[PDB]
């Protein structure tokens, strides 16, 4: 009975468009809203077999594909399509999640869902609903697979102070079901870089950075002794912090029309690679990271340099990633370029901190391809120029301290560098 | 007059500074194990050895900084003093911790200092609040690196202004580490006192 009801009631959404907004469009919108409300009501407080679930999912997919397949109009901005889609996307996603967690779903239906969602990636409301559902799934995954509550955490307290979908017969939230569900829902939009509208790309990547931040918070909160009397061994299961890097590396080579997306991707990758790494990354990943960082640092837009320097403390140098010598020269050049500019919004403090952090590398890293004497001369010239030109007191103080550290290093190693006297003169005049 | 003369003689005649030095081994993230260490790595011992000579507390006539003659608080401690500045380190790897009362005494001695040199070889970043203490406005943290290099990170209270010749995130070699760390700690103590 309910199967034939939904099959017969699917026609209300397939109703013809109306040219009269005040009455015909309003009535059609109200009827479709009532139908989707009763669909949402029945999707939660009722039980059904797999055939009913498949029929409901097919009906929802067909309705979404039919009512939202009119992109040929630009001057016409009827509220009908967006008004329906705003609720339709949420209903479709919730129904899909419930069906997947309740009964088995064939892979053909999954492929059809992926295709119909990828072909309709030009709507911002879809992006917002995907972000919200991903947040909810991530909260569920954190609560289930890792035994960590998102509402209250040991770090938060310190601040205050087999599954059926997996081929079994168990229904509910389980580590097997939640993991695969979260992994599959992540790629519903498909390859993000295929998105055309730059605003949509920026929104998706901002939400991706927020997602990575939540994952990092969960990872940091793990393995904490509540009693402060015995340090537990690290768990065998850790959140996958560096999983989105494949999207970021491709998003970094997009043309200039996606500048905001490139900035967000740079911020995300820089914040990702600047923390402690539980497992050593593979050689190919390191090659890709070095290539993208080299391309970013030697760019021309000042915003790229500002974003890549403002979020890259020398902790990246401290991590000791293999083969990071070329980054020394690239960072020196980037710091010189950013400090040459006199814009007051530039990250002067971070720039001078990065510049002074490398002050001891050339002496200990003799005969580095990226000459040692030439690199030292360039670095000391930049330091001397900064110590007498920085308009910000914090940057000037850091520059003076770095110059003093350089003098101490030169004296200790007994280089007999003629530039030492000039640095002493600079200190004396100060 | 006798009481006033005794009180005047009690006051020091130089600049006195009190510094706490900790130690962290791999896999330690709790107060009990961090305060129960009785020895450190070779690099840590060399670094502490570069902060001043050793003085026998039994027959030491200089500054004490809360230490006791009976040997309960330890038998040796590093000592560095000049014509006008005198600094004594409360190294946590020299004070015996074989009993709970010893742990309480060590905690109440180290928690009264305003500068902490928190050496850390741990695989995870140091977190504020591991060792409870009312004081501790400056916490210099050292993370060893490859090729004998070292990493220095400084966390300070917002009220404390810029004080040290070692900026946050500075990277120094092994030779410069003791002198720079000692000078930074002295300057931090001066800033905290002037606060």
């Amino acid at each position: 009975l309910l199967q034939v009801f939904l099959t017969n009631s699917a026609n209300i959404f397939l109703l013809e468009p109306c040219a009269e907004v005040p009455v015909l469009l309003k009535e059609q919108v109200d009827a479709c809203k009532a139908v989707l409300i009763i669909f949402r009501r029945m999707i939660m407080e009722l039980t059904m077999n797999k055939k009913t679930w498949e029929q409901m999912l097919q009906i929802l997919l067909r309705i979404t594909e039919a009512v939202m397949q009119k992109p040929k109009d630009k001057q016409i901005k009827d509220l009908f399509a967006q008004s329906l889609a705003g609720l339709l996307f949420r209903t479709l996603m919730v129904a899909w999640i419930r069906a997947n967690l309740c009964v088995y779903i064939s892979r053909e239906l999954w492929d059809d869902f992926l295709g119909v969602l990828s072909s309709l990636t030009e709507w911002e409301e879809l992006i917002n609903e995907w972000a919200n559902i991903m947040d909810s799934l991530t909260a569920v995954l954190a609560r289930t697979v890792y035994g960590v509550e998102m509402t209250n955490l040991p770090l938060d307290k310190l601040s205050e102070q087999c599954s059926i979908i997996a081929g079994g017969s168990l229904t509910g939230w389980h580590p097997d079901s939640a993991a695969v569900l979260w992994r599959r829902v992540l790629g519903i939009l498909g390859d993000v870089n295929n998105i055309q509208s730059p605003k949509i790309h920026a929104r998706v990547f901002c939400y991706l950075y927020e997602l990575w931040y939540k994952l990092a918070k969960i990872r940091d909160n793990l393995a904490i002794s509540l009693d402060n009397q015995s340090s537990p061994s690290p768990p065998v299961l850790i959140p996958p912090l560096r999983m989105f890097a494949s999207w970021l590396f491709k998003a970094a080579t997009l043309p200039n029309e996606y500048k905001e997306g490139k900035l967000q991707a740079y911020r995300l990758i820089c914040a990702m690679m600047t923390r402690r790494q539980d497992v050593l990354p593979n050689s190919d990943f390191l090659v890709h990271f070095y290539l993208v960082m080299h391309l970013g640092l030697t760019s021309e837009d000042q915003d790229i340099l500002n974003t890549i320097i403002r979020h890259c403390p020398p902790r990246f140098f401290s991590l000791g990633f293999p083969g990071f010598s070329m980054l020394v020269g690239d960072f020196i050049t980037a710091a010189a370029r950013v400090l040459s500019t006199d814009i007051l919004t530039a990250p002067r403090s971070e720039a001078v901190t990065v510049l002074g952090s490398l002050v001891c590398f050339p002496n200990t890293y003799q005969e580095i391809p990226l000459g040692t004497e030439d690199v030292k001369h360039y670095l000391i010239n930049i330091l001397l120029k900064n110590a007498t030109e920085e308009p910000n007191e914090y940057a000037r103080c850091i520059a003076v301290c770095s110059l003093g550290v350089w003098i101490c290093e030169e004296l200790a190693q007994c280089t007999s560098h003629p530039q030492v006297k000039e640095a002493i003169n600079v200190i004396g005049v100060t | 007059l006798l009481r006033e003369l005794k009180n005047l003689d009690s006051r020091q005649c130089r600049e006195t500074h009190k510094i706490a030095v900790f130690y962290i081994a791999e896999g330690q993230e709790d107060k009990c194990s961090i305060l129960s260490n009785e020895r450190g790595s070779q690099a840590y011992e060399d670094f502490v050895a570069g902060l001043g000579w050793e003085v026998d507390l039994s027959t030491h006539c200089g500054f004490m900084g809360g230490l006791q003659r009976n040997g309960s608080t330890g038998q040796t401690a590093p000592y560095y003093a000049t014509s006008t500045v005198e600094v004594i380190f409360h190294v946590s790897t020299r004070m015996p911790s074989d009993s709970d009362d010893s742990l309480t005494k060590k905690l109440r001695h180290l928690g009264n200092d305003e500068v902490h040199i928190v050496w850390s070889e741990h695989s995870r970043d140091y977190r504020r609040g591991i060792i409870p203490t009312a004081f501790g406005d400056v916490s210099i943290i050292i993370y060893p690196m490859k090729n004998h290099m070292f990493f220095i990170a400084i966390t300070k209270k917002p009220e404390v202004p810029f004080f040290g010749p070692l900026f946050d995130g500075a990277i120094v070699s092994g030779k410069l580490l003791p002198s720079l760390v000692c000078a930074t700690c002295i300057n931090a103590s001066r800033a905290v006192k002037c606060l």
Binding site: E390, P391, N392, E393, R396 | S83, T84
Partner: peptide, 24 residues
């Protein structure tokens, strides 16, 4: 960049006394 005895006499007296006494 964008930006009660007097201490100096006492400091001068202390420095002179220290230099006279402890130098060498």
């Amino acid at each position: 960049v964008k930006s009660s005895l007097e201490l100096i006499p006492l400091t001068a007296r202390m420095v002179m006394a220290h230099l006279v006494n402890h130098l060498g």
